[PDB]
């Protein structure tokens with residue numbers, strides 16, 4: 001049984017998925033994701049959802065070098081929920097570069113309407129990165145990786161993974 005305290009101190013990306021897809025007993029399905037730069041209004045990324053072991057749990061992002069100097073980005077997330085009520089829906093997203101923790105985001109979802117489509121806004125406050133780190137992250141695309149742990153009532157129900165490029169394609 002993995003709880004939030006079990007991931008709040010992780011200093012490395014996990015070597016595997018901490019939970020199976022069947023553990024998503026709340027039928028939580030992310031159907032849309034949009035990232036906006038809060039200092040310019042620019043839509044940095046948008047996706048709409050229409051046997052690989054990842055099965056939709058791994059996403060690869062391709063951003064520009066300017067993304068690493070952003071102060072704050074806004075994430076709009078659309079997701080459906082099953083019949084089971086969802087209380088204390090939490091997401092802990094940890095970003096690492098070459099086994100070095102860079103930032104962890106602890107987001108608490110607002111009320112979730114059961115058996116319906118929900119929309120939430122997550123505000124990411126980026127920390128200032130050292131010039132050496134920014135340079136390395138630009139030179140090494142996809143070596144920046146993240147773990148997104150989703151908790152419902154302190155119980156891990158979803159675990160998604162991603163890697164990032166900041167080389168501007």
Ligand SMILES: O=C(Nc1cc(Cl)c(Cl)cn1)[C@]12C[C@H]3C[C@H](C[C@H](C3)C1)C2
Pocket residue numbers: 035061067068073075095102103124126127129144164
């Ligand atoms: O990729 C990142 N943040 C991100 C990515 C997405 Cl796809 C969304 Cl939705 C929201 N934030 C960062 C940028 C830099 C500052 C931290 C630590 C690392 C360097 C990785 C976050």
